[PDB]
Amino acid sequence: INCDPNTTTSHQLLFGFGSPIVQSVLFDGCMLDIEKDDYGFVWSCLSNENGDYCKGLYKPRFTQGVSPNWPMCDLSGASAERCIYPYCPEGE
Amino acid sequence: NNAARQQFVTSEVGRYGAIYTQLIRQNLLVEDSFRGKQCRVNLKLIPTGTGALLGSLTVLDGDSRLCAATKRAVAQVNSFPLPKDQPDVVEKLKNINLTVAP
């Protein structure tokens, strides 16, 4: 993850079905905020062959290095709207 | 490993690349200002069951308004298909450059 607000990379994060639109996530040490475009937050919840889940697009905020006392994001049930993501690299 | 396999992988990357580009195009909101414009992106995909979901999208270059529409369009794709039992192809498909146009 390139942790700079001016990155041109957006990260998709997954959450439990029925989550509120998760606003800020500490992802791999980088604080990310939900993206918003002309049509609203770039967020949707789905119920299909991939199960019941929600997804959002996220980019780093300006302020980095804050260590918040937040819960882990819920990837199955409704997540808190500020949470620490349970990320792990591929084959690790 | 061998030249024949390299040919197959190159062919499959082209085929799935086209599938992915079509999936994005189907979700893309059409605007007149996009005429003759392009957005070049990189997709990082995460294998999920039999297919793949979006991991990250990097906007490389292109028309600013079309690139914004492309981001939403990519975010709206339900799933990206992957070949069964072709791990070498999957490796290339998980990190793929695409050109999106209306």
Side-chain angles (χ1 to χ4, degrees), chain A, chain B residues 2-83 86-102:
Chain A
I1 160 78
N2 181 29
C3 198
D4 172 40
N6 296 130
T7 185
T8 62
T9 304
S10 297
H11 277 80
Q12 169 162 299
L13 297 179
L14 305 175
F15 305 93
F17 200 63
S19 288
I21 306 182
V22 177
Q23 295 293 294
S24 298
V25 176
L26 190 61
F27 175 83
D28 207 26
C30 188
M31 190 70 76
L32 310 187
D33 291 347
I34 186 71
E35 295 196 70
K36 189 171 180 278
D37 66 13
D38 288 347
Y39 299 89
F41 293 110
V42 190
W43 171 278
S44 62
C45 301
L46 318 74
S47 182
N48 58 31
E49 59 288 331
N50 296 123
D52 300 353
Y53 71 103
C54 304
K55 59 179 173 176
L57 280 193
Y58 293 81
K59 283 176 73 161
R61 69 162 65 168
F62 177 70
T63 301
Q64 299 297 333
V66 175
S67 188
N69 188 8
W70 289 350
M72 300 302 296
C73 303
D74 193 343
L75 276 45
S76 172
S79 189
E81 67 284 340
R82 287 186 171 79
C83 56
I84 302 172
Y85 211 77
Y87 168 78
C88 177
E90 261 276 66
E92 189 175 305
Chain B
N2 59 83
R5 190 62 187 177
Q6 292 191 0
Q7 292 186 349
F8 176 77
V9 174
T10 300
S11 185
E12 286 292 273
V13 169
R15 193 172 67 82
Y16 280 93
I19 290 166
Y20 300 166
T21 306
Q22 170 68 20
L23 286 169
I24 297 162
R25 280 192 280 104
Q26 281 183 144
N27 293 125
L28 194 66
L29 265 297
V30 50
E31 298 192 45
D32 288 323
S33 76
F34 299 167
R35 193 177 68 177
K37 303 294 178 171
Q38 296 185 347
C39 188
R40 294 200 313 107
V41 298
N42 170 266
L43 279 64
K44 290 180 169 64
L45 298 178
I46 303 168
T48 308
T50 58
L53 302 187
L54 180 69
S56 65
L57 189 290
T58 303
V59 174
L60 301 170
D61 60 21
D63 178 73
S64 65
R65 286 175 297 177
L66 177 56
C67 286
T70 296
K71 281 171 56 191
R72 165 148 299 219
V74 173
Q76 281 173 328
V77 173
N78 285 337
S79 178
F80 297 84
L82 289 173
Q86 290 172 26
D88 54 353
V89 175
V90 174
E91 287 300 295
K92 294 298 183 178
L93 295 182
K94 282 169 59 177
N95 184 8
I96 188 167
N97 297 329
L98 304 176
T99 300
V100 180

